[PDB]
């Protein structure tokens, strides 16, 4: 028993290596990337969405580490991670691994609520989602991979081993977070906001529970907490918004909204991002009843 074959004829899973002309005898590089061609080709209908030149060929044939004429000196690095890709007035607009994943988060309603307010860390755990080779790869295979003298038979074995060894990280249950939270730090013109904490988290999670792209990148058990509880270590008891966001203006931290704007911008930000019908940003009592 092996990986399921593709309709396209491309290998089901593929190790991608840092291909360039320059010798790399010490194997100075990121871990290589195992790309699952099978699941991507099933999800994305047009081959040439990715194979933007119409050549059903490895990107690295034109995009090398240093760059070359066949790819107009757009490097491997650029081709795989580019985020600011200009629309092409004629013919195909290329995509990168990173730009397409990001477009997914902006374009799909079930993703665009959280992703309207998340700021991604882009840390080691992020890189490792792709830079993910199996440990059984040898330095020798690495050189061969780098030199392009690896046999596809060996490439595919390494790739199937990695894929078969992958395990999806389970998000913690919303049962381990508060049922409700009475937000009353600022209560004055209005009553406290009775935020449906667990209802909200449960709902957001259910809409993405089987998404393979979300599952790969949502890769620490408490990472979804950080959607709102941002910029602090993942934890089942994060610090309060009011620890960092002051009630009055904080000249020392102009990037920081004051605490009322913090709640408004975050709550309303998601609501707008995934087109919540109620409450509207102009509805001033649904989130907090007027005080008597």
Q: Which residues bind a copy of itself (CB under 8 A)?
A: 18, 22, 24, 26-31, 65-67, 73, 75-78, 82, 84, 121, 123-124, 127-128, 131, 178, 185, 232-234, 237-240, 242-244, 246-248, 250, 252-253
Q: What are phi and psi of 149, to 5 degrees?
A: -110, 15
Residue 22: is it exposed, middle or buried by C-beta count within 10 angstroms (0-12/13-18/19+)?
exposed
- The yes or no reply on residue 107 touching ligand HEC (CB under 6 A) is no
Residue 167 known to bind ligand: no
51 annotated as belonging to a binding site for a ligand: yes
d(CA 233, CA 226): 9
11 is a contact residue toward ligand HEC (CB under 6 A): yes
Task: List the one residue from 3, 130, 158, 159 that touches ligand HEC (CB under 6 A).
Answer: 130
Diameter over CA atoms, the chain: 77
Looking up tokens 């087109």 gives: 275
Residues 6+ apart with CB under 8 A from 194: 180, 181, 182, 183
Between residue 220 and residue 259, which ones bind ligand HEC under the rule CB under 6 A? 222-232, 236-245, 252, 255-257
What DSSP element (H or E) covers 125? helix 124-130
Question: What Å distances lie between residue 174 and 76, 145, 196, 267, 270, CA to CA?
Answer: 40, 43, 12, 18, 18
SS3 at position 120: coil
3 annotated as a binding-site residue: no
Q: Which does 283 bind (CB under 5 to 8 A by kind): a copy of itself, ligand HEC, none?
A: ligand HEC
Category of 60 on φ-ψ map: left (φ > 0), alpha (ψ -120 to 50) or beta? alpha
In the complex with ligand HEC, the residue whose CB is nearer, 2 or 88, is: 88
Residue (232 or 285) nearer to a copy of itself, CB = 232
- What residues form the annotated binding site? 37, 40, 47, 50-52, 59, 62-63, 81, 97, 100-101, 111, 114-115, 127, 130-131, 197, 200, 218, 225, 228-230, 241, 244-245, 264, 267, 270-271, 284, 287-288
- What residues form the annotated binding site for heme? 37, 40, 47, 50-52, 59, 62-63, 81, 97, 100-101, 111, 114-115, 127, 130-131, 197, 200, 218, 225, 228-230, 241, 244-245, 264, 267, 270-271, 284, 287-288
């Amino acid at each position: 028993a092996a990986l399921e074959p593709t309709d396209s004829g491309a290998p089901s899973a593929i190790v991608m290596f840092p291909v360039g002309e320059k010798p790399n005898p010490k194997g100075a590089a990121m871990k290589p990337v195992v790309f699952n061609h099978l699941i991507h080709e099933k999800k994305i209908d047009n081959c040439e969405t990715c194979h933007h030149t119409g050549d059903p060929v490895s990107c690295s044939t034109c995009h090398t580490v240093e760059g070359k004429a066949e790819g107009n000196y757009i490097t491997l690095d650029r081709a795989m991670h580019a985020t600011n890709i200009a629309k092409r007035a004629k013919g195909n607009t290329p995509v990168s691994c990173v730009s397409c994943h990001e477009q997914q988060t902006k374009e799909r309603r079930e993703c665009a609520g959280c992703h309207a307010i998340v700021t991604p860390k882009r840390d080691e755990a992020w890189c490792a989602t792709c830079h993910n080779i199996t440990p059984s790869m040898t330095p020798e295979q690495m050189q061969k991979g780098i030199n392009g003298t690896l046999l596809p038979g060996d490439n595919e074995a390494l790739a199937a081993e990695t894929v078969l060894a992958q395990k999806t990280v389970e998000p913690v249950s919303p049962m381990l977070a508060p049922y409700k939270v009475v937000i009353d730090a600022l209560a004055d013109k209005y009553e406290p906001s009775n935020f449906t904490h667990r209802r909200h988290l449960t709902s957001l999670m259910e809409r993405i529970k089987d998404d393979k792209l979300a599952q790969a990148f949502h890769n620490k058990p408490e990472i979804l907490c950080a959607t709102c509880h941002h910029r602090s270590p993942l934890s089942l008891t994060p610090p309060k918004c009011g620890s960092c966001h002051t009630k009055e203006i904080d000249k020392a931290n102009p990037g920081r909204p004051n605490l009322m704007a913090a709640y408004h911008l975050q709550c309303m930000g998601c609501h707008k991002g995934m087109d919540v019908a109620r409450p509207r940003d102009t509805d001033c009592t649904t989130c907090h009843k007027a005080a008597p």
